[PDB]
Design an enzyme around this catalytic site. Structure first.
Site, PDB file in Angstrom:
ATOM      1  N   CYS A   1     -19.998   2.525  34.435  1.00 30.98           N
ATOM      2  CA  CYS A   1     -19.771   1.351  35.266  1.00 30.98           C
ATOM      3  C   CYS A   1     -18.393   0.766  34.992  1.00 30.98           C
ATOM      4  O   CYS A   1     -17.773   0.214  35.903  1.00 30.98           O
ATOM      5  CB  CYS A   1     -20.841   0.280  35.055  1.00 30.98           C
ATOM      6  SG  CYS A   1     -22.505   0.790  35.542  1.00 30.98           S
TER       7      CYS A   1
ATOM      8  N   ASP B   1     -19.844   3.199  28.761  1.00 31.96           N
ATOM      9  CA  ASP B   1     -20.220   1.992  28.022  1.00 31.96           C
ATOM     10  C   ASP B   1     -21.602   2.250  27.465  1.00 31.96           C
ATOM     11  O   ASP B   1     -22.297   3.183  27.919  1.00 31.96           O
ATOM     12  CB  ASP B   1     -20.156   0.701  28.891  1.00 31.96           C
ATOM     13  CG  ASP B   1     -21.117   0.722  30.141  1.00 31.96           C
ATOM     14  OD1 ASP B   1     -22.175   1.376  30.161  1.00 31.96           O
ATOM     15  OD2 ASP B   1     -20.826   0.039  31.145  1.00 31.96           O
TER      16      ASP B   1
END
Ligand SMILES: [Mg+2]
Ligand SMILES: [Mg+2]
Ligand SMILES: [Mg+2]
Ligand SMILES: [Mg+2]
Ligand SMILES: [Mg+2]
Ligand SMILES: [Mg+2]
Ligand SMILES: [Mg+2]
Ligand SMILES: [Mg+2]
Ligand SMILES: [Mg+2]
Ligand SMILES: [Mg+2]
Ligand SMILES: [Mg+2]
Ligand SMILES: [Mg+2]
Ligand SMILES: [Mg+2]
Ligand SMILES: [Mg+2]
EC number: 1.7.1.13
Lengths: 145, 145, 145, 145, 145, 145, 145, 145, 145, 145
Positions: free
Chosen positions: A36, A43
């Site tokens: 993202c 992440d």
């Protein structure tokens, strides 16, 4: 299809056998990761999703597959916790829902986003209002280790 | 006859000696296991049961047994936390009760269901609503280990 | 080309400036994930990599990438901890190296594999044997949460 | 058959792809419970099983099923950790193995049994001798809570 | 007797049926209390008893009682850790035994006595010496809280 | 008297030199033990006694002796936490008081009883009411270890 | 000098009034930061400097100022942990010394470098050797949080 | 004396009931403060005192008092830990002793001194050499809070 | 500039595309350091910044830099928590914002300042007041270690 | 003064740069000791001081010194915590203040006193009433160690 791309379609519900009451369900999800970020570096998060069903409950297996579908998904248009809340609202039409995410640090700083929702005009909206006002008042100690 | 089968009828109550006050009784129950999942794999959890007796108090040895009796039981006519609360409401007719499960991960995710109850239209119902509103507001670090 | 495929060749070394001593370098790596399990579900783990360089040191940004490159890779010609150690031995020819995995539960169980290596017939080999003998002697409380 | 009775037969092995070296594998197993006690009350443990394979590795799925087979097994003849070590020795013929169990208390006292084994006449026997002498030198703090 | 006084007589043993190997048993006893101080006021400790049986195991109910027996016992001329050790050594004739006490503060000072024992002229006598020499190398943090 | 049996008469007070404020005092009491349980086995608990004095304060040394007096006492014709709060109400006539106990487990279940009291018709009763509706909302994690 | 750049000349000693024993001194240093990384971003670490003096001891205040001096310094033409151990060897000529660093993560990976030194040909070199073979054998758990 | 100055004369000893074995006594001492810093400003530590007795054991109350006597004591030409070890050496002629201090930060840095002593020419001297070699190999994570 | 001085100019914002609801963002910044003390020596804290955007989010790289900018900045006439708040309030015009600092010891004393802000005449002004009133009700344990 | 007696005169204040908002300052004070016990024997606490300033803020060094001044101070006719709050009230005329002590055990029991104060007739007085109501609702587990 869940394997290579984002699959909100993979989500499945079943009837809440206890519409009669407020049944509170929380999912600790520490194996979350995605593409993202704007940078393409992955992440990593523990995502806590809590909700009160109305007609519908979400199947836990489908949730897992659903969350896995984020793994390699770098078509991030709208913010990722929101995508998760929206999809699950679309699915269950819940009385209450929240998505809390605790991220690994990047640049010496870790981001903990939080959204919730309760049915407009009900005590559940007051609940969301209250759980926002009170959010994370007592923070766990962070030393990056 | 007993150590295999679901046994809601081994439960036993005894008379509350302090009916004048609100006496709070918490049972921490880390040794809980059942076949409740539809799959057939067993589940494991710490169950926390908090109640305020009215006239009747549950006796602990019987609660131990009742709980062991879920070992080999796994039916989902109804959910297991709710099954547990109901048999307890049946047995005691208490002012207030809640059943909080913290389960071990399956597919990376752990499920922590929670239901409560308070005598309808009394202050206890207000407490139920309130405790639900403030439920699990400061979650625990869940890293799967 | 890269962010999907297993990429042992993005690794990079640089020259050790203190070849005279035994410099100990530990990389803690909590953001590790792969498809190594035969099933197809991904796995997650903290990987600890400790080494004593000889002439060559691995550069950290490249180790980050190498490790991300296991995201979508999952082949078992060979085991993944060993794959990781080998590519590292290939790259650096170090005095001593070990790769220690702490994984998340599947079916209730968590797996913590560990292999080490030291230059044959040297004091480092003695260290490998020794570290294996004292390995994980004081384990950590693992309650699944 | 694993469901109702003890099933050492359910264990499966596969070839250790790294006979060339000492590969150390540990299984954290916190969902252990059985009817081994003389009293018929169940017992509950986290069992840590560590081993170095020779020809053979144990399949983790079969282990889980194997450990589940103890759930309702009250034919306890020989001590339970030993049964577990023996069965796994019979299965893999390992270089090293140990079974460490940390039990929930009964009578205000919790029992932590421990056995290990290394191939007679090899460094692995010295390893077992050493891991015994050094066992649990630094005990986690126990307050029954 | 154990009801209100020191009761060695309650200790009970049984044949160790895993005698052709070294089986390590730790008892964590965090409910220990006595009038061993000469001050006449009670004391409180967790007591860790670790042993390696020769031919006989301590029956653990009997050890619950024996320890209980110390509840209202004003100090023997001896010290209570050692009397605990002796009585267990008498009952069992063990290869190795240790008793470690962590007492609560008095004067702002907590006392942790430790004694052990390996059968004279065996390897366990060497172990005793070893565990003595390595005792408490990595001590817990005391804040008195 | 204060050696082998229940001694409420050991309790003692002294003037609160601050009747003008709410002075909030908390006693942490980890060395609590009694024969309260029906069965006759000891129990063990950390007992937390928080309170706001009116004119009188309890002299700490006498509370120590008072609690000591429960050591050989099991007249569970009342409940022990309530007896404690009561004798303290009798001795002090305080604006506010509570007695929270945390007991070690038995049959794998640990019990945590809680009662409070605020002067009727004043804001203290509001307090007792609020703290009761908020009781133990953010629970300590229990595994028996 | 000691405000914006590397200042080894700030270091200072005083006579060890105990040349007759091994006096073991440890400095815990949590407020360490520099511009060592190639990139030019700061790093951050707790640095642990343990050592046994010969004739000279380092005066604590100057070590504070010395470490402060790394704040704006990134001459990684050597390694920063080795520079620290070295300047301290230069200043003290100690029997033994080590420098263990724990850095915060970057790219999701945190680096922990460790070097030591014992006077050559003496037992201190034996020590440096042993402590190096035993380094960080019982690792701290890293999750980035 | 005790009240307002350094008072070694306040230490009693009493007969060791167990000369025929090695009886290990650890004192945990979290309430230590003094004016030993050069400055004049006080310091605060947990001191950990451990020793094996020969024929004399230290009287536990005297140690509390002796330790209290450092409260306003400034400097001799010795470090405070050695003063403690020397005084205890004179008092008891012990087989082994060690003093471990952990102090609170000053200037971003906390100091952890350590000394010990075994009877010269005995196995105790081997133990002391050994325990210095093994000293503080596994340190707690320091963050100043 | 941020390289060696205070740099508001580096702060950057972007449109919040989840504007028709309340999105809570916490930044944990455990790598904070400045010369804010008037003493000219640096200080160290974790800084927790929590906000609820109106129309604009803080771009988090820019916040990494802005915070970095404080590294060599001798105190503004103002206090640094509030300047951090102001600058963020200017950049973003947020519904709610707080900045909480946990500093490391000096003098044996750690300072935790806290300021917040809710848009004037909105519910967030009521939240500010609320989070102020409830601030730090359950404070972490400070041992200085 | 400071050195050897109670010294309120040692507290400075300085101007509050932020009168137009509520600026919350917490001091964590783990190095507190005194002779306030009736006995004459010293005590040891962490004191937590929090306040909102009106026009004056306390000078941080003066507080350290002021607090040091209690070191040999015995008794007034007041409890020590109130003496602290009063002195700080006089000094700054604060909007809100509170003193929270956590002391070390004496006789198996640790005492945790707490007072506070809001400006009479303001929202601060409402806050103080509120914070007393909510006081220490979620206590840490006390075991004396
Ligand atoms: Mg509906
Ligand atoms: Mg941390
Ligand atoms: Mg009724
Ligand atoms: Mg964890
Ligand atoms: Mg070479
Ligand atoms: Mg846990
Ligand atoms: Mg073979
Ligand atoms: Mg515990
Ligand atoms: Mg503690
Ligand atoms: Mg009464
Ligand atoms: Mg526990
Ligand atoms: Mg140099
Ligand atoms: Mg962590
Ligand atoms: Mg700490």
């Amino acid at each position: 299809n869940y394997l290579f791309e984002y699959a909100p379609d993979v989500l499945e519900s079943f009837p809440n056998k206890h519409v009669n009451r407020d049944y509170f369900v929380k999912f600790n999800c520490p194996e979350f990761t995605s593409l993202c970020p704007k940078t393409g570096q992955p992440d990593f998060a523990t995502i806590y999703i809590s909700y009160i069903p109305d007609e519908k409950m979400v199947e836990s297996k489908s949730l897992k597959l659903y969350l896995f579908s984020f793994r390699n998904h770098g078509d991030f248009h709208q913010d990722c916790m929101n995508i998760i809340m929206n999809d699950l609202i679309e699915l269950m039409d819940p009385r209450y829902i929240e998505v809390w995410g605790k991220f690994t640090p990047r640049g010496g700083i870790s981001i903990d986003p939080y959204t919730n929702y309760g049915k407009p005009g009900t005590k559940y909206e007051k609940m969301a209002e209250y759980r926002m006002m009170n959010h994370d008042l007592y923070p766990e100690t962070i030393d990056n280790r």
